[PDB]
Design a protein around this nucleic acid. Structure first.
Length: 229
RNA sequence: UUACAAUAA
């Protein structure tokens, strides 16, 4: 135990934000992990494969679209099942910034520690960060196997976290599905999916996807989802 | 805490 898990909402303080901005969010996250735990930080890069943390997009208190607008504060979410990944993103964001992203200045306001709904099976999930699943293009939800991949990754992420035989009951049904393409530097096409869906299965199974993510790029800001209730 | 993204390989 182990199994308790963690989720964070961080809040910063008229400003601007881009799209395709999740490589720059890769910056503020590792910066504060090195600034706390320098061995943990370097480790994660070369140490490779799906990491046990994920984080949301950078949203605002409002969305405006002529980059785009900005207003009263702004924020994002972070979830990981590895206690130190979080302790080093809480500690490093604390004794530090002063945060400045791209070049926009900002000042740390609060870090609100959310809760884990113990409700998972059947609950509705909406993507906080889009979803990518890649194979050799990026398979969309109309694809029969988008589901075998997304499931499997979670079964592994499961034992990766639980050190135990993976739970085998997972289905997901998708209501709203939105396409999009991102620039991960310099030269790549990641076709992700903004999603709303119902997912039933082993409770703990989906607990994981909740925390670490759904799909591949969890360390780049894909695959983080929220519960509706 | 927002079913909240402009671009389309």
């Amino acid at each position: 135990h182990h199994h308790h898990g963690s989720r964070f909402l961080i809040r910063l303080v008229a400003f601007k934000v881009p799209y395709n901005h999740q490589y720059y969010l890769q910056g503020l996250i590792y910066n504060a992990i090195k600034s706390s735990n320098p061995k943990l930080a370097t480790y994660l890069h070369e140490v490779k494969g799906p990491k046990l943390f994920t984080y949301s997009l950078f949203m605002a208190e409002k969305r405006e679209h002529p980059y785009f607008l900005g207003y009263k504060k702004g924020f994002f979410y972070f979830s990981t099942c590895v206690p130190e990944i979080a302790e080093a993103l809480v500690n490093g964001l604390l004794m530090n910034p002063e945060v400045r992203l791209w070049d926009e200045r900002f000042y740390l306001h609060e870090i609100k520690v959310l809760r884990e709904p113990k409700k998972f099976n059947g609950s509705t999930f909406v993507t906080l960060s889009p979803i990518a699943v890649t194979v050799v293009y990026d398979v969309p939800p109309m694809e029969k196997e988008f589901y075998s991949i997304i499931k499997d990754d979670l079964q592994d992420k499961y034992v990766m976290a639980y050190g135990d035989k993976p739970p085998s009951e997972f289905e997901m049904e998708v209501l709203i599905a939105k396409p999009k393409r991102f620039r991960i530097k310099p030269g790549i096409y990641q076709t992700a999916w903004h999603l709303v869906f119902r997912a039933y299965g082993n409770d703990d199974l989906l607990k994981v996807g909740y925390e670490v993510g759904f799909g591949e790029k969890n360390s780049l800001g894909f695959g983080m989802v929220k519960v509706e209730g």
